[PDB]
Subunit: 456 residues, 3 copies
């Protein structure tokens, strides 16, 4: 047999695999789960394209299902480049503000325990990358209207680098200032949904058609480009979500399965709530994207709460986030803008309803179901520890002020450069073109090239 | 460091999460597999939508693929409400006929050995919850022509409470009475396929178009609304069925993988059997829904058997089920109904053909591969325990009489209330016309409401 | 409790399961991960049907997505029949050239430790059978134009028997002659990709339409039947590939997750490389299938490498395989053949690029991360051992010589038996130009029978 004669470092590379069995630090069952979960979280990336392409009331030229592969490629590459480092490095340079570049090019990402200690660096980095790929596929879907492909890549890269990563460092790193503060966030109310959501708002305001003919009064609330596309994307997203929330436990203990039950319940309820609110708000008619929008809403709602709150409380978290989001979509008719408040009214707002409600129903008797793997939490309002709701709004503010600020800067800087302008203004574009090659899901038959925006 | 000081209870909640590592009664590898097996079982719900929406010789007003997220949401919620309780509670009400309401609202559910002791309560409930949502979707597809969406919600919820859960407790509860009798049903050939399949038959005979014109002598047998929908339906369902059967072993032992192999070989032979039977019955032409209909008929046939029967017998089961089901589709041209019997000829007849054949080929040596996790079965007819076919037939008839009677009562009772009758009669309806909105998979571009039947 | 009073045998059936707990030889977590990864690999089979039906510049009468359940059904069966035997028999019939038929009809495959000792036969046979079905699908892929269905079945069954199974014996069976020579092939650079690729090249030269109109000078290089098919096929494939490669570790150790991170990075870099090359070769226009084709190319290139090479080299293997496969599609316009050098230029050419570059970057310390489960390697050029590239080339030439020789003998044989002729010549064919029923994915609506070639 191959015999080892060394002890794991518990730092850096984690040890020498030639002389040290780095797997003894970890459980094979915890790894075999978070490994499968990784593959499962990724199938949410094309589910996010299928959803928001299909929900949109404007045909997009850049197919969002198609683009979601480019979102995978430049996010998987940004994560390898310096992404995993800037977020989840073992050493940070602030009050815990952003990581260093010790993990550039995935240098020394091998077998040391991560910020989740039940898992080696390389398995955590794989898992957490899909979270980035998910988020960056959302940010893509909020900013895809009349987008240009290469400035879209550059935008995504830079956005993930200077917006998602520092916020992930705050919330999920073992040394992030919001983790020390007390901000609870299971699977990314703040990191994935609040970030992508509000950059979707910051898109709507800075770019994106103002005074949009699709938002005029008396124009329908739902005119979906493809119902099928909305329903397929929810199948992938709901399925992928059991792994998104399940694996955030970091292990295979009761806590992971407790949080999948909370995840599906808050889905069912959030769905059934939206479906029905719309039934009344639309006059005894059953909406066609009503259910599916509700399902997603209740899933964003329970994202930050999944591994903290009681099962019954999920029902509450799904109903409030369903309703709150159903009403939030109506904000499209006050600004008279469409792009891309679709992403905002479900992820930005659902992210906030969730991160608060998280700090209300947060129980210690749920979190301890990870037993032996526990990183103890003080409790929430249902535990008579009342000041947790402030620790959440602290997270909600930092993650919001930073996204809303830096995304604004990023878009406007990219706008001053003609070579990188994300979206063209109508006076530049060859407006009105052979855009009949879209395309229920992607593009019409024998379409060899994507119909990109041109100028003059 | 943090330590735990208290022994698990083995009753009720099974322990105090805060003074008992509840996990120490279960293997993290067993749990992590039934956890992912859950999410896998769930992706069958829209597969059932797709497969029967697309196999239909009729445009359905209610898109089955759409209606499957609705069948997820009211089943997940019914499971949480009192579903897990009525079917799987630790104490039964007399003889082992139904469970108590001790798990109402998922009160008192976690870290306690369930009815499969290798799994806690909260995980066996998540896993088994998906089996509910799969039968909900099958009851849907059989009972959905001209169906109204809100009676259909109310119908599932009720059908799932007074038909599924009692038969579930009979066969899968530790204390159930069909367990004690000797009835073998690995993964639901009694609970899932025979019950939803026969609620299809009950639908065809009570509601659903009598003397349907699609069934006249000379009119074609197959004529699929959408072949793609059938095939992507089979893709999901087969994917799919591997966790459905594989996780029913309750553990990750050799037994799980012996039963995944039997699953795919029965599918492979159900498929080729139906496909080649159709080739000779249709005058030497390869049908478009023959292969996929045999794959599902074969997967149904092996469903009660995958964990007891030798691999080689999966061939015998796939070939006989796919044949018997092929004939059972011809039942439509004798009854002159359709509405109906697709969800019956595959699941109803398949579930029966399956469960009888489990009594004939069950082997003591195959069940035993579970190792230190076994419940030792005497075996079946090839172990010369002739008395097994009878216990299987005893299980069929118990499950068959309680479904035909209570679905008949539930459909007639509901047929008497204008607020809730599932399907409007031919005279109070108003055809068509919204077909121009259906829909290869769901609904046409920019549809906003589902074309619910309204009365004159 | 049930007590076990026997010891595992090591051979045949592994022991009597009635008196031995065969599970004690194996780790549940390892078995669990490779069991889920089985079903994950399966979903790659319709991905190959979706991907190559959409890439085609010719619309095919036999839908690859439809026929991919046929590839699945007859490959499962050929595995049960004698495929697992011929490839992974414990006793190879000299000198590690092909197995025996000791596992015929899956006799004795159960609990013995397989050719990967950390997994029982029955689980390793399930898992590896999916690699077969992936290959049978890729071989159906490149040989479907104007294919006849029953000859297509018989061709797959024999091609899987006398071409896939020997080569799998040589490089994967524990006693195989390329194993003991030194050839590294992690997850199927030779057995899966190089074989089916080169079988496409052999088809294209022998049966494919010579002097095809779609390849005359100035005819577009890309004219995809369906961008949506290409994108959905990549979603299933890229999801499934994480289990394809990750499960090739044979276990849940850090080597499995290290290999999944290589897999994704090479995909990402293969997609962007092709996408950017296409951009500059098609004159500043972004190709509609470029990004995806490079994703599949990169996943092909890293297939033999994933478990042996440093993460950073996945960038190199991705760019070189992306670019190399790009160039190779231009071969269609030198031979003036289309069907079916689509499969050749990604799988054939990517197999060889991948397997060579595996010998250059194999690293003893990456392989060593499986810790207690390794058979150590010297490594390749970067460990300063230069014999490894030799062993790679030896494996390439054996695999290439065999499939190019035997596929030709097999195609030319069948092509001389009127009723087994795979593809009718344009002079005996009826040429019913009813391509009107050939849909985007499968068949149009109410299509009933597949359109098989007939003769005047």
């Amino acid at each position: 047999s191959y015999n080892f004669t060394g002890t794991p470092t518990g730092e850096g590379t984690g040890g020498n695999s030639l002389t040290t069995d780095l797997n003894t630090q970890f459980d094979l069952a915890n790894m075999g789960w978070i490994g499968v979960a990784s593959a499962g979280v990724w199938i949410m990336v094309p589910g996010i394209g299928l959803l928001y392409s299909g929900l949109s009331r404007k045909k997009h030229a850049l197919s969002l299902l198609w683009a979601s592969m480019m979102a995978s490629a430049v996010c998987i590459f940004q994560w390898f480049f310096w992404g995993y480092s800037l977020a989840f490095s073992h050493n940070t340079r602030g009050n815990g503000f952003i990581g260093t570049l010790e993990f550039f090019g995935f240098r020394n990402v091998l077998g040391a325990p991560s910020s989740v200690s039940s898992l080696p660096d390389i398995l955590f980095a794989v898992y957490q990358g899909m979270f980035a790929a998910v988020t960056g596929a959302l940010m893509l879907g909020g900013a895809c209207e009349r987008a240009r492909l290469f400035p879209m890549m550059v935008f995504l890269f830079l956005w993930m680098t200077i917006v998602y990563c520092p916020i992930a460092c705050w919330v999920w790193n073992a040394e992030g200032w919001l983790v020390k503060l007390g901000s609870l966030d299971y699977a990314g109310g703040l990191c994935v949904h609040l970030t992508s959501g509000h950059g979707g708002l910051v898109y709507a305001l800075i770019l994106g058609k103002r005074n949009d003919p699709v938002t005029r009064k008396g124009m329908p609330k739902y005119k979906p480009h493809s119902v099928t596309s909305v329903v397929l994307g929810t199948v992938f997203l709901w399925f992928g979500w059991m792994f998104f929330n399940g694996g955030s436990a970091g292990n295979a203990t009761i806590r992971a399965w407790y949080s999948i039950m909370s995840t599906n319940l808050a889905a069912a309820c959030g769905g059934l709530t939206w479906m029905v609110i719309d039934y009344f708000r639309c006059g005894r008619k059953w909406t066609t994207v009503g259910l599916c929008s509700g399902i997603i809403a209740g899933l964003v709602g329970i994202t930050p709460a999944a591994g903290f709150v009681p099962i019954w409380s999920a029902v509450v978290i799904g109903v409030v986030t369903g309703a709150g989001c159903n009403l939030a979509v109506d904000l499209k008719s006050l600004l008279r803008i469409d792009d891309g408040l679709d992403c905002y009214s479900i992820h930005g707002v659902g992210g906030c309803i969730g991160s608060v409600l998280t700090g209300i129903f947060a129980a210690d008797y749920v979190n301890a179901t990870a037993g032996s793997y526990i990183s103890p939490i003080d409790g929430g309002w249902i535990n008579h520890h009342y000041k947790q709701v402030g620790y959440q709004l602290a997270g909600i503010c930092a993650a919001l002020a930073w996204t809303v600020t830096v995304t604004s800067i990023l878009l406007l800087t990219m706008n001053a450069i003609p070579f990188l302008k994300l979206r063209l203004s109508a006076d530049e574009e060859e407006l009105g073109t052979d855009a009949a090659q879209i395309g229920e899901f992607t593009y019409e038959e024998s379409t060899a090239y994507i119909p990109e925006p041109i100028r003059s």
